[PDB]
Amino acid sequence: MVPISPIETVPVKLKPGMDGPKVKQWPLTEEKIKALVEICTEMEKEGKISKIGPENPYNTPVFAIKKKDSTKWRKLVDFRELNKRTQDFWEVQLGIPHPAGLKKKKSVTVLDVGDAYFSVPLDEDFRKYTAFTIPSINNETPGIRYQYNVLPQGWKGSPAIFQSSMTKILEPFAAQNPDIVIYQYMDDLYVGSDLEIGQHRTKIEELRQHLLRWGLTTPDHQKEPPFLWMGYELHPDKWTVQPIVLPEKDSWTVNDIQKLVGKLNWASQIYPGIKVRQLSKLLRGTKALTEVIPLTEEAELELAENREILKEPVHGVYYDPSKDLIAEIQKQGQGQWTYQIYQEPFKNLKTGKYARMRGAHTNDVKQLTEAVQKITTESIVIWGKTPKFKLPIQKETWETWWTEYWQATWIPEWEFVNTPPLVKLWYQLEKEPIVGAETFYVDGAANRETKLGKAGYVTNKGRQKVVPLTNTTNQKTELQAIYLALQDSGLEVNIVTDSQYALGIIQAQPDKSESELVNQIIEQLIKKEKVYLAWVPAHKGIGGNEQVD
Amino acid sequence: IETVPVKLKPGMDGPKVKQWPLTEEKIKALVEICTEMEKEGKISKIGPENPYNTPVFAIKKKDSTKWRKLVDFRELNKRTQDFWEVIPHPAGLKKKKSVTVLDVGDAYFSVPLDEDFRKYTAFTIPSINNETPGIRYQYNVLPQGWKGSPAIFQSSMTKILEPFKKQNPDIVIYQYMDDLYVGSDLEIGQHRTKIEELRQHLLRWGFLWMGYELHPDKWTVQPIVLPEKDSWTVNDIQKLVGKLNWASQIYPGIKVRQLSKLLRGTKALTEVIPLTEEAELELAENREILKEPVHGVYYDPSKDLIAEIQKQGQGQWTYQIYQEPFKNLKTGKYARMRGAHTNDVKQLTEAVQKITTESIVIWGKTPKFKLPIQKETWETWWTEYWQATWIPEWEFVNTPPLVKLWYQ
Numbered sequence: 001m002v003p004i005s006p007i008e009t010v011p012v013k014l015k016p017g018m019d020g021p022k023v024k025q026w027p028l029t030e031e032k033i034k035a036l037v038e039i040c041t042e043m044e045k046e047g048k049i050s051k052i053g054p055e056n057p058y059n060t061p062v063f064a065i066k067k068k069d070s071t072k073w074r075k076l077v078d079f080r081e082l083n084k085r086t087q088d089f090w091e092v093q094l095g096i097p098h099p100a101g102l103k104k105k106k107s108v109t110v111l112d113v114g115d116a117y118f119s120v121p122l123d124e125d126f127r128k129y130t131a132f133t134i135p136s137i138n139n140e141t142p143g144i145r146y147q148y149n150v151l152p153q154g155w156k157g158s159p160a161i162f163q164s165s166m167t168k169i170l171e172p173f174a175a176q177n178p179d180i181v182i183y184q185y186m187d188d189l190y191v192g193s194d195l196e197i198g199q200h201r202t203k204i205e206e207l208r209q210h211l212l213r214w215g216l217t218t219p220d221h222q223k224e225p226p227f228l229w230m231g232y233e234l235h236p237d238k239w240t241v242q243p244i245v246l247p248e249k250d251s252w253t254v255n256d257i258q259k260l261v262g263k264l265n266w267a268s269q270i271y272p273g274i275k276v277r278q279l280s281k282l283l284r285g286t287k288a289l290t291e292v293i294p295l296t297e298e299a300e301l302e303l304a305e306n307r308e309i310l311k312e313p314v315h316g317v318y319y320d321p322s323k324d325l326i327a328e329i330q331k332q333g334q335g336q337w338t339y340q341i342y343q344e345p346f347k348n349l350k351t352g353k354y355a356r357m358r359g360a361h362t363n364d365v366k367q368l369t370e371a372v373q374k375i376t377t378e379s380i381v382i383w384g385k386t387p388k389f390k391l392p393i394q395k396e397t398w399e400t401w402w403t404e405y406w407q408a409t410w411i412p413e414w415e416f417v418n419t420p421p422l423v424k425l426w427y428q429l430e431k432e433p434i435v436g437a438e439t440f441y442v443d444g445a446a447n448r449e450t451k452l453g454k455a456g457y458v459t460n461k462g463r464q465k466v467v468p469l470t471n472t473t474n475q476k477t478e479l480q481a482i483y484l485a486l487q488d489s490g491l492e493v494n495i496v497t498d499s500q501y502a503l504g505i506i507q508a509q510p511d512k513s514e515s516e517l518v519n520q521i522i523e524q525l526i527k528k529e530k531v532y533l534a535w536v537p538a539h540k541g542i543g544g545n546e547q548v549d
Numbered sequence: 550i551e552t553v554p555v556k557l558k559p560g561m562d563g564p565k566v567k568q569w570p571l572t573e574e575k576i577k578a579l580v581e582i583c584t585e586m587e588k589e590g591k592i593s594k595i596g597p598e599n600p601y602n603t604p605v606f607a608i609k610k611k612d613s614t615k616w617r618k619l620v621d622f623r624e625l626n627k628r629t630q631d632f633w634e635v636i637p638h639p640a641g642l643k644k645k646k647s648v649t650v651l652d653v654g655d656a657y658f659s660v661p662l663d664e665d666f667r668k669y670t671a672f673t674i675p676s677i678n679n680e681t682p683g684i685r686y687q688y689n690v691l692p693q694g695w696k697g698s699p700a701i702f703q704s705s706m707t708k709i710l711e712p713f714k715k716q717n718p719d720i721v722i723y724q725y726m727d728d729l730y731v732g733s734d735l736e737i738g739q740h741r742t743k744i745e746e747l748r749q750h751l752l753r754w755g756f757l758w759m760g761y762e763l764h765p766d767k768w769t770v771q772p773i774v775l776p777e778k779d780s781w782t783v784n785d786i787q788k789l790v791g792k793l794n795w796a797s798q799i800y801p802g803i804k805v806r807q808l809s810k811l812l813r814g815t816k817a818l819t820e821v822i823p824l825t826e827e828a829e830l831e832l833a834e835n836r837e838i839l840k841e842p843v844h845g846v847y848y849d850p851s852k853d854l855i856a857e858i859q860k861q862g863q864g865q866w867t868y869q870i871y872q873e874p875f876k877n878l879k880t881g882k883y884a885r886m887r888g889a890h891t892n893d894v895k896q897l898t899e900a901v902q903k904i905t906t907e908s909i910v911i912w913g914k915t916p917k918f919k920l921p922i923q924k925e926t927w928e929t930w931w932t933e934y935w936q937a938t939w940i941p942e943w944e945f946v947n948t949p950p951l952v953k954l955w956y957q
């Protein structure tokens with residue numbers, strides 16, 4: 001007898017104030033009962049479970065199901081109730097690795113630890129809560145009562161406790177072998193390295209011995225590269241997404257489009273330049289999966305371009321920590337941005353995209369900024385560092401923008417790449433009033449009940465306009481007043497408004513907007529040489545005139 | 550040697566707060582520091598049965614090459630029971646000529662933590678690309694940055710400093726979180742020697758060698774001022790009237806009528822308007838009113854302090870601390886260039902730290918900030934520039950305020 005180290009149990013409690021499960025065992029067929037008796041006899045013999053006396057009040061339902069194997073029975077304990085009453089655990093499975101962060105490995109071996117799973121003991125004081133009952137033949141005897149001594153399949157705490165026990169066991173082996181990597185997924189251990197295959201198989205045997213010290217046996221594998229893992233294909237020197245197939249359809253429902261957008265989003269992390277906007281714009285205000293939605297021409301074009309990008313396999317390379325990280329961004333239009341992250345030119349570690357946030361007004365520079373922050377954050381997650389940026393914006397443009405912008409804003413180290421369309425500032429307001437330029441005092445108002453209103457201006461040269469408006473509001477008429485002033489002035493103009501709303505919008509410097517009015521104003525601004533916008537308080541007896549009702 | 554029992558507030562579980570992405574260097578730093586702390590029994594490894602988490606990162610404090618672990622305990626702190634010693638905070642601290650800030654946090658590590666509360670201090674050192682399980686720890690002792698640490702350690706601290714306080718009766722000592730604020734009116738060199746006396750006094754009785762020197766008596770504030778001009782344009786008068794209208798929400802007697810009478814008629818913005826006598830008198834009277842303090846301004850310890858910051862351009866920032874709107878407890882301005890000339894966010898982060906420091910000295914707590922920045926930008930970059938061992942609360946303002954104009 002070679003003494004094996006015990007695996008320390010994890011103390012487990014029920015959620016506070018909650019008791020164990022008490023759930024009636026279902027009636028089962030005589031066949032299923034005999035099957036369950038046999039299975040549980042084997043399990044008991046292996047030490048996985050133990051017969052318990054009448055004292056234990058707790059119960060969890062057990063089921064017998066025809067196995068995935070053609071001839072066999074399988075035991076299914078249904079732990080939903082116990083799971084509801086079981087404490088939350090630390091879940092280490094959160095935030096899965098991204099393949100673009102992995103390092104290339106000369107060899108990667110798989111080791112089945114499935115047997116090690118049942119070597120993991122369940123906390124003694126918690127075992128009673130796992131009690132279950134095999135119903136007796138014809139209900140004429142007490143059912144056979146069992147409880148688990150090991151982590152039960154389907155129980156809430158089993159994956160986290162398994163993982164943490166395995167990690168704790170592997171820690172000294174990993175730390176004393178820095179030239180390999182070890183990763184645990186399901187019932188498998190994966191061991192990569194760059195060593196010669198002899199030295200590699202050696203380290204593997206050493207690992208099997210190390211595991212043996214806890215009495216953990218490995219089968220001495222079916223799985224080999226490429227690995228299909230969490231939606232990817234991992235190869236020794238390269239990775240990609242599992243095949244992306246865009247279905248042919250004469251018609252699309254909401255569900256079809258959702259699935260399509262999901263495939264496209266998943267593909268976008270490697271296939272460069274994927275666009276989802278025109279396809280996603282169909283999905284808003286539906287909620288009915290079966291509802292057939294006709295595709296717009298724009299959606300059709302987007303889908304076609306996607307099909308073209310997806311026509312043949314693309315691969316990302318892995319991360320080399322000795323080389324710098326570079327991120328490059330392009331504007332695709334309609335609030336869509338796309339990016340590539342690489343180290344050596346033309347070999348992408350990964351790709352991606354950014355959609356503008358839902359909002360009333362926006363501009364290209366803000367969007368580029370957001371894309372930069374997103375890429376920065378993802379990059380710190382994946383590589384632990386910020387990439388060098390290549391951006392379609394001139395240094396001078398950025399300088400002007402952030403120096404004059406009312407908000408603090410920043411972009412990490414970056415350089416201009418000249419690849420149209422370039423991001424630019426479309427208009428720039430004046431900081432001081434313009435000498436020689438006509439001064440327009442604007443105002444607007446609307447009756448809240450009738451929704452009748454007026455917008456207009458009076459200037460220093462005696463120029464004047466008042467336009468009557470129907471179906472409008474105060475804010476709309478203030479904007480419309482400014483629009484009129486822009487429309488009717490020369491290339492240089494001073495505009496005086498009392499509207500805090502309009503000033504609030506314009507000082508945000510949008511180059512685009514949901515409101516067609518704001519859009520028209522922006523077009524006007526673009527056409528101007530110089531615009532000074534001044535605000536005054538309303539109702540103070542200033543040259544801004546009502547006049548407008 | 551004996552742990553004081555600690556509990557959370559009734560009806561509240563421990564914090565579960567996601568660890569945010571950390572850079573490679575911060576991760577290495579935290580692994581070294583935490584390895585040493587584990588060897589020193591300050592922290593212990595924990596298992597999956599501890600669901601709780603508090604975020605962690607590392608900072609380099611003022612003029613030092615050594616990383617310092619920083620836990621963001623804000624959630625735990627608001628969830629932690631109010632500890633009532635049964636402090637009024639010193640009013641004389643801000644009146645002293647020089648205040649030196651010392652990092653006394655290390656001391657906390659000498660007092661064991663209540664067992665049943667330890668689980669709530671759980672934190673994670675993440676791995677790059679989550680390729681290895683995050684290293685999980687909890688605190689065996691009073692952690693730096695936790696609300697309960699100064700409250701618990703207070704009895705020890707007062708006893709440690711009895712000789713120094715008794716023999717230096719005019720020196721004002723205040724403790725906030727990990728920091729010791731020592732004010733005195735002495736000469737700067739003599740001051741530094743007395744501070745050194747205090748830190749050796751601490752070393753004897755159990756990185757405190759650093760110091761941060763503030764001169765509260767030199768804190769400038771910001772009364773409202775109006776322009777003095779020989780010739781006023783229409784634009785000048787419009788801006789003046791806007792500003793006075795804004796001041797009238799604060800100061801009762803502000804009048805714009807006569808000044809407004811110059812803005813009747815539609816005139817070129819750059820045209821010069823001679824002031825009438827009634828207008829000049831109105832201006833003079835307004836100027837007088839603005840020299841008086843604001844009516845009905847009081848601090849209430851039961852209420853939040855609120856801080857607003859405006860970017861004025863060219864590295865200049867204005868700020869206001871208040872509890873109620875248009876009742877300003879303090880206003881200020883920073884023209885400071887500290888290593889930040891090309892970086893807005895670094896500037897803002899330093900402004901936030903300075904304002905928080907001032908707020909701690911004056912009222913003994915920290916304001917909730919309203920930051921002129923997008924959430925994503927701030928959240929991405931602020932930990933890179935953070936030098937302070939506490940952290941305040943903040944929100945974000947996405948609509949440009951008009952008030953910027955009026956604060957300069």
Ligand SMILES: Cc1cc2cc(C#N)cn2c(C)c1Nc1ccnc(Nc2ccc(C#N)cc2)n1
Nearest residue numbers: 102103105181183190192225227229234235236
């Ligand atoms: C060893 C490792 C293996 C592994 C198998 C699966 C699955 N299924 C998932 N794994 C993870 C996540 C690992 N962990 C790490 C850690 C560092 N670098 C790599 N690089 C790397 C390179 C090539 C391949 C291939 N083929 C696989 C990993 N992997």
Ligand SMILES: [Mg+2]
Nearest residue numbers: 139140141142
């Ligand atoms: Mg009978």
Ligand SMILES: [Mg+2]
Nearest residue numbers: 243244310313
């Ligand atoms: Mg494909």
Ligand SMILES: [Mg+2]
Nearest residue numbers: 443498538539
């Ligand atoms: Mg008006």
Ligand SMILES: [Mg+2]
Nearest residue numbers: 380929930933
């Ligand atoms: Mg960063």
